[PDB]
Amino acid sequence: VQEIDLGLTCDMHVHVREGAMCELVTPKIRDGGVSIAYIMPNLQPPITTLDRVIEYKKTLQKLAPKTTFLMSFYLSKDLTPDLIHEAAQQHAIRGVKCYPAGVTTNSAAGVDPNDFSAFYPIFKAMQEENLVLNLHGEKPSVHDGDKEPIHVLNAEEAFLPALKKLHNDFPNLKIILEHCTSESAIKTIEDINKNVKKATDVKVAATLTAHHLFLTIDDWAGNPVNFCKPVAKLPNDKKALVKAAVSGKPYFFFGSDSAPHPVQNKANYEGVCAGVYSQSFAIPYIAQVFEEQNALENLKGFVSDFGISFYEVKDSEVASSDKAILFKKEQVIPQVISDGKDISIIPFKAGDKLSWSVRWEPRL
Amino acid sequence: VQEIDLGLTCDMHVHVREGAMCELVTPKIRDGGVSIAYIMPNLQPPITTLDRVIEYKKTLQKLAPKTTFLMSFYLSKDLTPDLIHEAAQQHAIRGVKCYPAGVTTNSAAGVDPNDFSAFYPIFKAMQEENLVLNLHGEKPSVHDGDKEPIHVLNAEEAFLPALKKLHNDFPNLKIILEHCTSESAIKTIEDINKNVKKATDVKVAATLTAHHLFLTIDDWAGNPVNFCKPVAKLPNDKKALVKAAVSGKPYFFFGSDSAPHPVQNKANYEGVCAGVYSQSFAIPYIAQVFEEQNALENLKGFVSDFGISFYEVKDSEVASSDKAILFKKEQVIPQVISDGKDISIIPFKAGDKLSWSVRWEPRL
Ligand SMILES: O=C(O)c1[nH]c(=O)[nH]c(=O)c1F
Ligand SMILES: O=C(O)c1[nH]c(=O)[nH]c(=O)c1F
Ligand SMILES: [Zn+2]
Ligand SMILES: [Zn+2]
Ligand SMILES: [Zn+2]
Ligand SMILES: [Zn+2]
């Protein structure tokens, strides 16, 4: 069977929750073919204190000794530049994640992106310490008022001005538009990186999920299992995301936004939790897309090289030197992912066949 | 206003199912303030025979003696012009309802709207007999190679040409675009109706639901109770729909598309049954919108006059001459609507309070 050495794969947008759910999903990072994971902070309550981010990381390390964990804070008014400096100097975080209030899971304690001025001391501190600003790039929805309507389909586009202003005001701060879903955002990212020759010059980048390379509005209209934020959009939006994923440009790399929810939290007549679970087969899912696009030679950049460069991950910190090897053995995605206890999860593309599997081969 | 005599109210798009669901729902037509109901045929199996439509109507008259029932056939492959003539000749149907295959509930036995040709003999029979052609105006989805993609968001616009072609080929056939959801469809309807002041001259009309005058994509993205076909669209679309509902134009009238489903069929992680249940408070829902638009003087036209005119309902046919009186007593919508057995339904806007109630006054 054909094999591809992906090296030290990284997934820069991971949700692993807490408690039993965290015990179930955290080992799946390695099983899905991911060596390095950027852990998002939207817990109940959000991670805003040094003590809880340190304890949280250790909990993950206990659950997966071979997975490299990059941690983050949740952008909040509780944060202070002093806390940022202290946490950065103790190597306890690599970035801060911004949730606008109301747009997704555990975003109620989030920010109004019609401001982002109140957090400039925070960004100033983050810029000094080389920390990354991760953005959930969606404006809260507005329907009345002569300003024009913001809904789930244009909320990402409506956010692009805020991104451009932040990059302008903090030109040396590393910023990521997480999980791009629209062609407009892909273009905005390319235009921001127009004068860029070295991958190491990228200051604004974007992550792409597995599921936004497959899904359009039709797949989640009627299927909460496929509902997530930002929602999958129109067929042209999908096309633009795939071209970027296979483009080889250093400002687009893999972030799954694997967002596990127990099935009973998706099977609601009301208040369906947003979020798609892709961790268990993260890298194989991406392989399908690069295969169908005849672009397997670019797979390594999208899932390894560009994320390592952008986050400046050194062999000094990786918890295991094992390389993820993709081998072309068909498998079937199970119907559920379960701990054999209270938790059952419906995986992305449940019941479908993947061309590729993934294994771990030692180095040297 | 405190009281408004709405007269002989009309709901020209009603689903009452069969069995216990029907026993629960059919009396709610009257309790919702509706005197006249156009009954849709997408049962299992679809209503495609004279005998079945008679027993259905008879089942409904035993559950609601004071409700006037206009019945319909399901446009299927089993229909024949002779059946159309015979059914019209016995006053057993007032129209035939078209479902594109796969787009909505119990539509698997429906038609491909890219080849309506095979049903033209049916349309000549309907045209001679002055029956109405009700259209669920959505093309089935396609994400294929050459042709432009069709999804739940443009499927109604993608259907407008077929509507125009049908109007051109059968200029005397009364045709309704049921449940309009897009500004593009509103434009197409007015345009078709550009040279019409008499109101008996309208041949193509469109019904507007209760829920589409409130909902946008944001309200059903995470709330299956609000998922329906055609989906609620963008704020601009709602804007056109509300404007048309209150416009006083005779080519737009009320059809609820009240579509009852048991709660367990909305709380799926996949395959959520499309459909919003509005029957229990049909008229109060519409009252809210006309109040908020300072247009209560147009309420009677939208829920009574224009539908009676277009369907040519004569006092010969009405099962009760009782008048619907809207009185401003503010009530609260239950969280559930139940028969006290296996069936529970989440009503539209469950738990909200409505300014208006409705009662029945006899004619004297
Ligand atoms: O995209 C996100 O930010 C997000 N974050 C989450 O914690 N859960 C989600 O389900 C989700 F869609
Ligand atoms: O919109 C329709 O046509 C429709 N008809 C139905 O019978 N049930 C539905 O749930 C529905 F959405
Ligand atoms: Zn997000
Ligand atoms: Zn996320
Ligand atoms: Zn319909
Ligand atoms: Zn219907």
mmCIF file of N, CA, C and O in Angstrom, chain A residues 208-287:
data_model
loop_
_atom_site.group_PDB
_atom_site.id
_atom_site.type_symbol
_atom_site.label_atom_id
_atom_site.label_comp_id
_atom_site.label_asym_id
_atom_site.label_seq_id
_atom_site.Cartn_x
_atom_site.Cartn_y
_atom_site.Cartn_z
ATOM 1 N N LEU A 208 -8.161 25.929 8.378
ATOM 2 C CA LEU A 208 -9.280 25.314 7.677
ATOM 3 C C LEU A 208 -9.589 23.982 8.339
ATOM 4 O O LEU A 208 -8.673 23.189 8.588
ATOM 5 N N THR A 209 -10.872 23.746 8.629
ATOM 6 C CA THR A 209 -11.344 22.518 9.243
ATOM 7 C C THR A 209 -11.400 21.413 8.202
ATOM 8 O O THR A 209 -11.307 21.660 7.004
ATOM 9 N N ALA A 210 -11.525 20.172 8.658
ATOM 10 C CA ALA A 210 -11.867 19.091 7.738
ATOM 11 C C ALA A 210 -13.269 19.264 7.174
ATOM 12 O O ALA A 210 -13.501 19.059 5.975
ATOM 13 N N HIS A 211 -14.238 19.576 8.039
ATOM 14 C CA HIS A 211 -15.636 19.488 7.624
ATOM 15 C C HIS A 211 -16.043 20.615 6.679
ATOM 16 O O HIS A 211 -16.969 20.431 5.878
ATOM 17 N N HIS A 212 -15.397 21.778 6.752
ATOM 18 C CA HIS A 212 -15.714 22.829 5.787
ATOM 19 C C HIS A 212 -15.150 22.550 4.390
ATOM 20 O O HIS A 212 -15.423 23.319 3.457
ATOM 21 N N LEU A 213 -14.319 21.524 4.232
ATOM 22 C CA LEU A 213 -13.866 21.103 2.914
ATOM 23 C C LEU A 213 -14.822 20.101 2.252
ATOM 24 O O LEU A 213 -14.623 19.762 1.080
ATOM 25 N N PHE A 214 -15.852 19.632 2.971
ATOM 26 C CA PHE A 214 -16.892 18.718 2.486
ATOM 27 C C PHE A 214 -18.280 19.345 2.435
ATOM 28 O O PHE A 214 -18.994 19.163 1.450
ATOM 29 N N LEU A 215 -18.672 20.083 3.479
ATOM 30 C CA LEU A 215 -20.044 20.501 3.754
ATOM 31 C C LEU A 215 -20.417 21.805 3.072
ATOM 32 O O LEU A 215 -19.602 22.725 2.934
ATOM 33 N N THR A 216 -21.691 21.883 2.694
ATOM 34 C CA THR A 216 -22.389 23.105 2.320
ATOM 35 C C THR A 216 -23.684 23.187 3.125
ATOM 36 O O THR A 216 -24.015 22.272 3.896
ATOM 37 N N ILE A 217 -24.393 24.320 2.973
ATOM 38 C CA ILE A 217 -25.615 24.557 3.748
ATOM 39 C C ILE A 217 -26.549 23.367 3.660
ATOM 40 O O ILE A 217 -27.188 22.992 4.652
ATOM 41 N N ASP A 218 -26.580 22.703 2.505
ATOM 42 C CA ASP A 218 -27.510 21.596 2.331
ATOM 43 C C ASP A 218 -27.216 20.437 3.278
ATOM 44 O O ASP A 218 -28.141 19.712 3.650
ATOM 45 N N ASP A 219 -25.953 20.222 3.677
ATOM 46 C CA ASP A 219 -25.657 19.060 4.517
ATOM 47 C C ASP A 219 -26.052 19.260 5.970
ATOM 48 O O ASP A 219 -26.203 18.264 6.691
ATOM 49 N N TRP A 220 -26.209 20.505 6.437
ATOM 50 C CA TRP A 220 -26.664 20.716 7.807
ATOM 51 C C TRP A 220 -28.081 21.266 7.888
ATOM 52 O O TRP A 220 -28.635 21.338 8.997
ATOM 53 N N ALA A 221 -28.675 21.688 6.768
ATOM 54 C CA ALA A 221 -30.105 22.011 6.763
ATOM 55 C C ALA A 221 -30.841 20.698 6.992
ATOM 56 O O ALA A 221 -30.967 19.877 6.080
ATOM 57 N N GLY A 222 -31.296 20.474 8.215
ATOM 58 C CA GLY A 222 -31.981 19.249 8.572
ATOM 59 C C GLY A 222 -31.120 18.239 9.294
ATOM 60 O O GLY A 222 -31.634 17.174 9.671
ATOM 61 N N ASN A 223 -29.847 18.566 9.554
ATOM 62 C CA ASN A 223 -28.886 17.640 10.156
ATOM 63 C C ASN A 223 -28.033 18.351 11.190
ATOM 64 O O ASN A 223 -26.896 18.745 10.909
ATOM 65 N N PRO A 224 -28.529 18.493 12.414
ATOM 66 C CA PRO A 224 -27.720 19.132 13.457
ATOM 67 C C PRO A 224 -26.338 18.545 13.600
ATOM 68 O O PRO A 224 -25.397 19.264 13.976
ATOM 69 N N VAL A 225 -26.175 17.257 13.309
ATOM 70 C CA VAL A 225 -24.854 16.645 13.403
ATOM 71 C C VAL A 225 -23.843 17.410 12.546
ATOM 72 O O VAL A 225 -22.650 17.441 12.857
ATOM 73 N N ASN A 226 -24.294 18.061 11.486
ATOM 74 C CA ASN A 226 -23.397 18.817 10.639
ATOM 75 C C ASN A 226 -23.438 20.310 10.932
ATOM 76 O O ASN A 226 -22.754 21.082 10.249
ATOM 77 N N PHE A 227 -24.234 20.738 11.914
ATOM 78 C CA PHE A 227 -24.308 22.149 12.292
ATOM 79 C C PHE A 227 -23.113 22.549 13.147
ATOM 80 O O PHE A 227 -22.842 21.917 14.174
ATOM 81 N N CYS A 228 -22.480 23.649 12.775
ATOM 82 C CA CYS A 228 -21.332 24.208 13.522
ATOM 83 C C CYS A 228 -21.171 25.685 13.180
ATOM 84 O O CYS A 228 -21.828 26.149 12.278
ATOM 85 N N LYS A 229 -20.361 26.392 13.956
ATOM 86 C CA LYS A 229 -20.035 27.784 13.662
ATOM 87 C C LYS A 229 -18.564 27.913 13.260
ATOM 88 O O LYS A 229 -17.695 27.264 13.854
ATOM 89 N N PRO A 230 -18.258 28.701 12.224
ATOM 90 C CA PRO A 230 -19.292 29.283 11.364
ATOM 91 C C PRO A 230 -19.926 28.197 10.526
ATOM 92 O O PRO A 230 -19.250 27.218 10.198
ATOM 93 N N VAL A 231 -21.206 28.366 10.207
ATOM 94 C CA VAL A 231 -21.926 27.361 9.444
ATOM 95 C C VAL A 231 -21.242 27.164 8.097
ATOM 96 O O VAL A 231 -20.595 28.071 7.560
ATOM 97 N N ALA A 232 -21.310 25.944 7.588
ATOM 98 C CA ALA A 232 -20.965 25.727 6.194
ATOM 99 C C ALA A 232 -21.921 26.522 5.308
ATOM 100 O O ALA A 232 -23.127 26.573 5.556
ATOM 101 N N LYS A 233 -21.354 27.182 4.303
ATOM 102 C CA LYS A 233 -22.021 28.114 3.398
ATOM 103 C C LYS A 233 -22.293 27.500 2.024
ATOM 104 O O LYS A 233 -22.721 26.344 1.919
ATOM 105 N N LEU A 234 -22.218 28.326 0.983
ATOM 106 C CA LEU A 234 -22.634 27.970 -0.359
ATOM 107 C C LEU A 234 -21.573 27.155 -1.090
ATOM 108 O O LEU A 234 -20.388 27.193 -0.730
ATOM 109 N N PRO A 235 -21.974 26.430 -2.156
ATOM 110 C CA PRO A 235 -20.993 25.649 -2.934
ATOM 111 C C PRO A 235 -19.798 26.446 -3.417
ATOM 112 O O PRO A 235 -18.680 25.909 -3.479
ATOM 113 N N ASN A 236 -19.989 27.694 -3.829
ATOM 114 C CA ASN A 236 -18.790 28.460 -4.134
ATOM 115 C C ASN A 236 -17.891 28.717 -2.931
ATOM 116 O O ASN A 236 -16.669 28.867 -3.111
ATOM 117 N N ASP A 237 -18.464 28.809 -1.741
ATOM 118 C CA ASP A 237 -17.606 29.044 -0.559
ATOM 119 C C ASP A 237 -16.765 27.788 -0.353
ATOM 120 O O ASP A 237 -15.585 27.915 -0.137
ATOM 121 N N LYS A 238 -17.374 26.616 -0.461
ATOM 122 C CA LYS A 238 -16.637 25.364 -0.311
ATOM 123 C C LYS A 238 -15.468 25.281 -1.279
ATOM 124 O O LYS A 238 -14.350 24.925 -0.893
ATOM 125 N N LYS A 239 -15.725 25.597 -2.545
ATOM 126 C CA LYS A 239 -14.692 25.546 -3.608
ATOM 127 C C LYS A 239 -13.502 26.410 -3.212
ATOM 128 O O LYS A 239 -12.393 25.944 -3.322
ATOM 129 N N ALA A 240 -13.746 27.631 -2.766
ATOM 130 C CA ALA A 240 -12.634 28.508 -2.405
ATOM 131 C C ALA A 240 -11.825 27.946 -1.238
ATOM 132 O O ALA A 240 -10.608 28.148 -1.178
ATOM 133 N N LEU A 241 -12.478 27.276 -0.280
ATOM 134 C CA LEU A 241 -11.753 26.753 0.873
ATOM 135 C C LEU A 241 -10.850 25.594 0.467
ATOM 136 O O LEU A 241 -9.711 25.486 0.934
ATOM 137 N N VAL A 242 -11.341 24.716 -0.407
ATOM 138 C CA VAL A 242 -10.524 23.611 -0.896
ATOM 139 C C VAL A 242 -9.328 24.127 -1.704
ATOM 140 O O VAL A 242 -8.200 23.640 -1.538
ATOM 141 N N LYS A 243 -9.540 25.117 -2.587
ATOM 142 C CA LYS A 243 -8.398 25.640 -3.341
ATOM 143 C C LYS A 243 -7.342 26.177 -2.398
ATOM 144 O O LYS A 243 -6.149 25.935 -2.596
ATOM 145 N N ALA A 244 -7.760 26.904 -1.361
ATOM 146 C CA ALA A 244 -6.791 27.406 -0.397
ATOM 147 C C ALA A 244 -6.105 26.256 0.335
ATOM 148 O O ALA A 244 -4.883 26.282 0.535
ATOM 149 N N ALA A 245 -6.868 25.223 0.722
ATOM 150 C CA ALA A 245 -6.276 24.132 1.493
ATOM 151 C C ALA A 245 -5.162 23.449 0.708
ATOM 152 O O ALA A 245 -4.118 23.095 1.269
ATOM 153 N N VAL A 246 -5.359 23.271 -0.594
ATOM 154 C CA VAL A 246 -4.384 22.593 -1.440
ATOM 155 C C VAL A 246 -3.437 23.588 -2.112
ATOM 156 O O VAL A 246 -2.605 23.194 -2.939
ATOM 157 N N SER A 247 -3.526 24.878 -1.755
ATOM 158 C CA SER A 247 -2.783 25.881 -2.521
ATOM 159 C C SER A 247 -1.273 25.861 -2.262
ATOM 160 O O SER A 247 -0.515 26.371 -3.092
ATOM 161 N N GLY A 248 -0.813 25.326 -1.136
ATOM 162 C CA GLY A 248 0.590 25.437 -0.792
ATOM 163 C C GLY A 248 1.009 26.767 -0.211
ATOM 164 O O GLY A 248 2.204 26.971 0.041
ATOM 165 N N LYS A 249 0.083 27.667 0.022
ATOM 166 C CA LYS A 249 0.450 28.955 0.598
ATOM 167 C C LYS A 249 0.662 28.826 2.110
ATOM 168 O O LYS A 249 -0.107 28.150 2.795
ATOM 169 N N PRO A 250 1.701 29.457 2.661
ATOM 170 C CA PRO A 250 2.014 29.249 4.083
ATOM 171 C C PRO A 250 1.039 29.905 5.049
ATOM 172 O O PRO A 250 1.197 29.723 6.268
ATOM 173 N N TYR A 251 0.041 30.650 4.569
ATOM 174 C CA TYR A 251 -0.903 31.308 5.461
ATOM 175 C C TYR A 251 -2.224 30.550 5.615
ATOM 176 O O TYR A 251 -3.157 31.081 6.227
ATOM 177 N N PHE A 252 -2.316 29.318 5.104
ATOM 178 C CA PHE A 252 -3.460 28.434 5.323
ATOM 179 C C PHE A 252 -2.959 27.114 5.894
ATOM 180 O O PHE A 252 -2.206 26.400 5.216
ATOM 181 N N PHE A 253 -3.400 26.754 7.107
ATOM 182 C CA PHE A 253 -3.053 25.429 7.624
ATOM 183 C C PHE A 253 -4.204 24.815 8.425
ATOM 184 O O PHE A 253 -5.219 25.449 8.718
ATOM 185 N N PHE A 254 -4.023 23.542 8.763
ATOM 186 C CA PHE A 254 -5.104 22.718 9.290
ATOM 187 C C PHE A 254 -5.444 23.086 10.725
ATOM 188 O O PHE A 254 -4.561 23.155 11.585
ATOM 189 N N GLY A 255 -6.728 23.338 10.970
ATOM 190 C CA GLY A 255 -7.286 23.429 12.300
ATOM 191 C C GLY A 255 -8.641 22.765 12.273
ATOM 192 O O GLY A 255 -9.538 23.221 11.558
ATOM 193 N N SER A 256 -8.808 21.671 13.008
ATOM 194 C CA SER A 256 -10.003 20.849 12.825
ATOM 195 C C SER A 256 -11.257 21.545 13.349
ATOM 196 O O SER A 256 -12.335 21.418 12.763
ATOM 197 N N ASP A 257 -11.132 22.303 14.430
ATOM 198 C CA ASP A 257 -12.272 22.705 15.239
ATOM 199 C C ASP A 257 -13.120 21.488 15.588
ATOM 200 O O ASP A 257 -14.355 21.540 15.647
ATOM 201 N N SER A 258 -12.442 20.378 15.849
ATOM 202 C CA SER A 258 -13.141 19.224 16.390
ATOM 203 C C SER A 258 -13.805 19.633 17.692
ATOM 204 O O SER A 258 -13.139 20.082 18.630
ATOM 205 N N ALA A 259 -15.123 19.518 17.735
ATOM 206 C CA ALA A 259 -15.922 20.077 18.817
ATOM 207 C C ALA A 259 -16.855 18.979 19.314
ATOM 208 O O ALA A 259 -18.018 18.897 18.897
ATOM 209 N N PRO A 260 -16.390 18.129 20.229
ATOM 210 C CA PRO A 260 -17.222 16.998 20.671
ATOM 211 C C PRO A 260 -18.372 17.460 21.550
ATOM 212 O O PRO A 260 -18.183 18.260 22.464
ATOM 213 N N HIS A 261 -19.563 16.936 21.267
ATOM 214 C CA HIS A 261 -20.785 17.061 22.039
ATOM 215 C C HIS A 261 -21.424 15.681 22.167
ATOM 216 O O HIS A 261 -21.470 14.938 21.181
ATOM 217 N N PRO A 262 -21.955 15.319 23.339
ATOM 218 C CA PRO A 262 -22.700 14.059 23.432
ATOM 219 C C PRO A 262 -23.921 14.119 22.535
ATOM 220 O O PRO A 262 -24.525 15.177 22.373
ATOM 221 N N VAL A 263 -24.260 12.975 21.925
ATOM 222 C CA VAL A 263 -25.337 12.922 20.933
ATOM 223 C C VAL A 263 -26.614 13.589 21.441
ATOM 224 O O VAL A 263 -27.339 14.233 20.675
ATOM 225 N N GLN A 264 -26.937 13.427 22.724
ATOM 226 C CA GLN A 264 -28.166 14.045 23.208
ATOM 227 C C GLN A 264 -28.081 15.571 23.183
ATOM 228 O O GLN A 264 -29.118 16.236 23.240
ATOM 229 N N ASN A 265 -26.887 16.150 23.090
ATOM 230 C CA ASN A 265 -26.796 17.592 22.916
ATOM 231 C C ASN A 265 -26.849 18.026 21.457
ATOM 232 O O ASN A 265 -26.908 19.225 21.190
ATOM 233 N N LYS A 266 -26.868 17.095 20.511
ATOM 234 C CA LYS A 266 -27.158 17.422 19.124
ATOM 235 C C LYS A 266 -28.601 17.136 18.743
ATOM 236 O O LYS A 266 -29.142 17.800 17.852
ATOM 237 N N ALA A 267 -29.243 16.190 19.423
ATOM 238 C CA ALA A 267 -30.601 15.759 19.093
ATOM 239 C C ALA A 267 -31.616 16.515 19.940
ATOM 240 O O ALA A 267 -32.310 15.945 20.787
ATOM 241 N N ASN A 268 -31.651 17.829 19.726
ATOM 242 C CA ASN A 268 -32.552 18.733 20.423
ATOM 243 C C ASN A 268 -33.537 19.322 19.430
ATOM 244 O O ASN A 268 -33.172 19.603 18.283
ATOM 245 N N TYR A 269 -34.784 19.535 19.862
ATOM 246 C CA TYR A 269 -35.661 20.337 19.014
ATOM 247 C C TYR A 269 -35.364 21.823 19.128
ATOM 248 O O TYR A 269 -35.858 22.605 18.312
ATOM 249 N N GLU A 270 -34.511 22.210 20.068
ATOM 250 C CA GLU A 270 -34.219 23.598 20.367
ATOM 251 C C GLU A 270 -32.828 23.667 20.974
ATOM 252 O O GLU A 270 -32.415 22.760 21.702
ATOM 253 N N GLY A 271 -32.109 24.745 20.679
ATOM 254 C CA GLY A 271 -30.791 24.896 21.268
ATOM 255 C C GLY A 271 -29.796 23.807 20.919
ATOM 256 O O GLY A 271 -29.023 23.389 21.792
ATOM 257 N N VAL A 272 -29.811 23.312 19.672
ATOM 258 C CA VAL A 272 -28.789 22.361 19.232
ATOM 259 C C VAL A 272 -27.409 22.953 19.445
ATOM 260 O O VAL A 272 -27.172 24.104 19.082
ATOM 261 N N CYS A 273 -26.504 22.203 20.065
ATOM 262 C CA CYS A 273 -25.117 22.653 20.227
ATOM 263 C C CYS A 273 -24.362 22.624 18.890
ATOM 264 O O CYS A 273 -24.395 21.637 18.169
ATOM 265 N N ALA A 274 -23.637 23.689 18.570
ATOM 266 C CA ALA A 274 -22.928 23.761 17.307
ATOM 267 C C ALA A 274 -21.715 22.874 17.494
ATOM 268 O O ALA A 274 -21.203 22.753 18.598
ATOM 269 N N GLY A 275 -21.189 22.309 16.415
ATOM 270 C CA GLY A 275 -19.918 21.627 16.602
ATOM 271 C C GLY A 275 -19.893 20.262 15.948
ATOM 272 O O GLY A 275 -20.827 19.459 16.077
ATOM 273 N N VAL A 276 -18.816 19.992 15.233
ATOM 274 C CA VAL A 276 -18.625 18.747 14.506
ATOM 275 C C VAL A 276 -17.404 18.056 15.083
ATOM 276 O O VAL A 276 -16.411 18.725 15.365
ATOM 277 N N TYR A 277 -17.502 16.740 15.322
ATOM 278 C CA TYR A 277 -16.402 15.962 15.890
ATOM 279 C C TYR A 277 -15.590 15.258 14.807
ATOM 280 O O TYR A 277 -16.042 14.262 14.240
ATOM 281 N N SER A 278 -14.367 15.734 14.560
ATOM 282 C CA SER A 278 -13.501 15.148 13.539
ATOM 283 C C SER A 278 -12.187 14.606 14.083
ATOM 284 O O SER A 278 -11.337 14.184 13.288
ATOM 285 N N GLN A 279 -11.972 14.635 15.401
ATOM 286 C CA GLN A 279 -10.639 14.341 15.922
ATOM 287 C C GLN A 279 -10.220 12.916 15.608
ATOM 288 O O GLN A 279 -9.051 12.663 15.278
ATOM 289 N N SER A 280 -11.170 11.976 15.662
ATOM 290 C CA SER A 280 -10.834 10.563 15.566
ATOM 291 C C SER A 280 -10.220 10.196 14.229
ATOM 292 O O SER A 280 -9.456 9.220 14.161
ATOM 293 N N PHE A 281 -10.495 10.965 13.176
ATOM 294 C CA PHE A 281 -9.933 10.661 11.858
ATOM 295 C C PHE A 281 -9.438 11.931 11.174
ATOM 296 O O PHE A 281 -9.449 12.023 9.942
ATOM 297 N N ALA A 282 -8.985 12.909 11.969
ATOM 298 C CA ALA A 282 -8.614 14.219 11.454
ATOM 299 C C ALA A 282 -7.786 14.127 10.190
ATOM 300 O O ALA A 282 -8.219 14.583 9.131
ATOM 301 N N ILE A 283 -6.607 13.519 10.267
ATOM 302 C CA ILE A 283 -5.688 13.516 9.122
ATOM 303 C C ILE A 283 -6.258 12.691 7.967
ATOM 304 O O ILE A 283 -6.232 13.169 6.823
ATOM 305 N N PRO A 284 -6.784 11.475 8.174
ATOM 306 C CA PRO A 284 -7.453 10.802 7.047
ATOM 307 C C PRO A 284 -8.512 11.657 6.348
ATOM 308 O O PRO A 284 -8.505 11.719 5.107
ATOM 309 N N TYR A 285 -9.383 12.363 7.088
ATOM 310 C CA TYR A 285 -10.367 13.228 6.426
ATOM 311 C C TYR A 285 -9.687 14.161 5.438
ATOM 312 O O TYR A 285 -10.150 14.339 4.306
ATOM 313 N N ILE A 286 -8.588 14.788 5.862
ATOM 314 C CA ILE A 286 -7.898 15.743 5.000
ATOM 315 C C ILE A 286 -7.277 15.044 3.797
ATOM 316 O O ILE A 286 -7.242 15.602 2.690
ATOM 317 N N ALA A 287 -6.780 13.817 3.995
ATOM 318 C CA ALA A 287 -6.202 13.043 2.900
ATOM 319 C C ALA A 287 -7.191 12.882 1.751
ATOM 320 O O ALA A 287 -6.824 13.079 0.589
#
